[PDB]
């Protein structure tokens, strides 16, 4: 068969190190790319082929109670340990991650079908924005 | 509202580099950490929170049609343009991607109920293979 649709679940990746090695890709990336399980969407038309892969990498969880002290062990990020307290300022929920590092928190809401995070440390802000899936 | 309970879809990432420098995460990790995308899920009951977060690596998606050579830009592996042009052998379908790297290319096909990515640079050979979803 030609027909090559569908959605494609890695099984296996044999010597995907000794590939990305010929294509000069430093160490610190194909140590992750090695392990990862690929999923590959093909969507074919006759001759004309749309692909897209994306792989799964790390989970985390974080459980605590606002208002209620916790240690936090940032492990997907710079594995620091820090002493977090969230709170509801308003309605936002607003988190501190006291440590080593200056301004440390990050504070999270909701508007409508939204959810917007932003994260502090020192003079830098990330913000990232959410959408209910 | 305070109800943040649900599965949250990012859709946006402003400033994580920034971020992720302030907190002291070395070059070759932000360079790979910026390529993530993240599902957040919250599961709220009053003031008590567990989250899950997952992070996803998305590759960008390709359209090529068979036949037409084209520039394909290798975002997600070395970061080369090369001339790709894939054609039927049989059921085979094979790429050849002309450019710095001798005898680079790639070959999918299916076989019984899986489909094989043979991928090849010189004389190192990648061989995947997946499961249909």
């Given at each position: 068969?030609?027909?090559?649709?569908?959605?494609?679940?890695?099984?296996?990746?044999?010597?995907?190190?000794?590939?990305?090695?010929?294509?000069?890709?430093?160490?610190?990336?194909?140590?992750?790319?090695?392990?990862?399980?690929?999923?590959?969407?093909?969507?074919?038309?006759?001759?004309?082929?749309?692909?897209?892969?994306?792989?799964?990498?790390?989970?985390?969880?974080?459980?605590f109670?606002?208002?209620?002290?916790?240690?936090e062990?940032?492990?997907?990020?710079?594995?620091?340990?820090?002493?977090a307290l969230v709170t509801?300022?308003?309605?936002?929920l607003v988190c501190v991650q006291?440590?080593?590092?200056?301004?440390?928190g990050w504070k999270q809401?909701?508007?409508?079908?939204?959810?917007?995070?932003?994260?502090?440390?020192?003079?830098?802000?990330?913000?990232?924005?959410?959408?209910?899936?």
């Amino acid at each position: 068969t030609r027909d090559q649709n569908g959605t494609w679940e890695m099984e296996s990746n044999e010597n995907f190190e000794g590939y990305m090695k010929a294509l000069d890709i430093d160490f610190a990336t194909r140590k992750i790319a090695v392990r990862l399980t690929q999923t590959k969407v093909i969507d074919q038309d006759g001759d004309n082929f749309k692909t897209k892969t994306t792989s799964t990498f790390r989970n985390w969880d974080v459980d605590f109670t606002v208002g209620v002290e916790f240690d936090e062990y940032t492990k997907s990020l710079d594995n620091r340990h820090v002493k977090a307290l969230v709170t509801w300022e308003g309605d936002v929920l607003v988190c501190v991650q006291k440590g080593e590092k200056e301004n440390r928190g990050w504070k999270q809401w909701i508007e409508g079908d939204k959810l917007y995070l932003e994260l502090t440390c020192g003079d830098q802000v990330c913000r990232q924005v959410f959408k209910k899936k």
